Write a protein that binds this ligand. Structure first.
Ligand SMILES: COc1cc(C(=O)N2C[C@H](C)OC[C@@H]2CCO)cc2nc(N[C@H](CF)c3cccc(Cl)c3)oc12
Ligand SMILES: *[C@@H]1O[C@H](CO)[C@@H](O)[C@H](O)[C@H]1NC(C)=O
Lengths: 250, 11, 27
C-alpha cells in the first residue's frame, strides 16, 4: 500500500496473508469470508504471463496478522488450503476480468479479536455503496512505493471513480466486473495498492447496518499510486453468484 | 531471511 | 450472521481512526 498508514490492531480482522511456503514470501492479500473460506484474486494463484500456478500445497493462509514478517504467536492463525477455486472465466489473457478465486481451508479458523470475517455485499449493498466518490478501504502488506515493504499491515481509504474516468485512464478494456478507485491528480490526497496487496479486500462500511462489506478485490493497477492512474478492483457483487455457487457446491 | 520462521507443524 | 462486525471496533462501539472518512463520503 502506497501512501497509507499502519493499520490499527483488529481493524481489518478479515485480512489474510497468502504466504508462500518455499521461498517464504508474501504472495498476496486475501480476505476471510467465513470460517473456512478465503477470497482472493485469481491472479495471485494463476497468472501464466508471470509462470504463476500455485497449488494448494504451495501456500499457507495467515489470518489475524498485523506484522508483515513476524510470527504472531497466540494471535495469527496459519491455515492450510484444502482447495483453490479460480473463476472459470477469469481472463488472465486480456485484462484480469473476473480476477477472483476462493480457497477452502482444511480446517475452520477460530474467530478472535483479530480474526473475523467480512461480509459480502448483496445487490442492494452494492447498488447503495458502489458510487463514484464513495470511499472504500484497501489494506495490505504490499510495497509502500512502486519502485519499501511495511512492518505492519497498511490501510488506505480511496474513493470509487466514475467509470468513464477509469476507462479513460488506461488502454486496457475495463469490464463491468471491475471498478476503479483512487484519487484524481486535481484531488492534493493519494494512495493505492502495490505489489503484494493483490487479492486483498476493498471494503466499505455500510452506513445502513454498520457492517463491513467487501466490495472489491485488489486486482491491478498500472504501477502504484501514479497520477492519473487508478486501482482496478474485482467487483465482488458481480461475481457473487459464482462465489455462492462454489461455496454451495463444495 | 525476511520472515520469521513459522512453527514446523504448519509446513 | 456476525460478518463484518469487528470485535475491537463495532462490537465495542469503538471507531477506528479513519472510518468516519468513509461515512462522510457516503453522501
Ligand atoms: C497480474 O497482476 C497484475 C498485472 C498488472 C499489469 O501490469 N497488467 C494487467 C492488466 C490487466 O493488463 C496490463 C498489464 C499486463 C501485464 O501482464 C498490474 C498489476 N498490479 C497488481 N497488483 C497491484 C498490487 F499488488 C496493484 C497496484 C495498484 C492498484 C491495484 Cl488495484 C493493484 O497486479 C497486477
Ligand atoms: C497448473 O497446474 C495444474 C497441476 O500442476 C495443471 O493441471 C494445470 O494445467 C496447470 N496450469 C498451467 C501451467 O497453466
Amino acid at each position: 500500500i502506497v501512501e497509507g498508514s499502519d493499520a490499527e490492531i483488529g481493524m481489518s480482522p478479515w485480512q489474510v496473508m497468502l504466504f508462500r511456503k518455499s521461498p517464504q514470501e508474501l504472495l498476496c492479500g486475501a480476505s476471510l469470508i467465513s470460517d473456512r473460506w478465503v477470497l482472493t484474486a485469481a491472479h495471485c494463484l494463476l497468472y501464466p504471463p508471470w509462470d504463476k500456478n500455485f497449488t494448494e500445497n504451495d501456500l499457507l493462509v495467515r489470518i489475524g496478522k498485523h506484522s508483515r514478517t513476524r510470527y504472531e504467536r497466540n494471535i495469527e492463525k496459519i491455515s492450510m488450503l484444502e482447495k483453490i477455486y479460480i473463476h472459470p472465466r477469469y481472463n488472465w489473457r486480456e485484462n484480469l476480468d473476473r480476477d477472483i478465486a476462493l480457497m477452502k481451508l482444511k480446517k475452520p479458523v477460530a474467530f478472535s479479536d483479530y480474526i473475523h470475517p467480512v461480509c459480502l455485499p448483496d445487490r442492494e449493498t452494492a447498488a447503495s455503496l458502489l458510487q463514484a466518490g464513495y470511499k472504500g478501504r484497501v489494506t495490505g502488506w504490499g510495497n509502500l512505493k512502486e519502485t519499501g515493504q511495511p512492518s505492519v499491515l497498511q490501510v488506505v481509504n480511496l474513493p470509487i471513480v466514475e467509470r468513464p474516468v477509469c476507462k479513460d485512464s488506461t488502454r486496457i478494456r475495463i469490464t463491468d466486473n471491475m471498478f476503479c478507485a483512487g484519487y484524481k491528480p486535481d484531488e492534493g490526497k493519494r494512495g493505492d495498492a502495490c505489489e503484494g496487496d493483490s487479492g486483498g479486500p476493498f471494503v466499505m462500511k455500510s452506513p445502513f447496518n454498520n457492517r463491513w462489506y467487501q466490495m472489491g478485490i485488489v486486482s491491478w493497477g498500472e504501477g502504484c499510486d501514479r497520477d492519473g492512474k487508478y486501482g482496478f478492483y474485482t467487483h465482488v457483487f458481480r461475481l457473487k453468484k459464482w462465489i455462492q455457487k462454489v461455496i454451495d457446491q463444495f | 531471511g525476511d520472515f520469521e520462521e513459522i512453527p514446523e507443524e504448519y509446513l | 450472521a456476525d460478518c463484518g462486525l469487528r470485535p475491537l471496533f463495532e462490537k465495542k462501539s469503538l471507531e477506528d481512526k479513519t472510518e468516519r472518512e468513509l461515512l462522510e463520503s457516503y453522501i
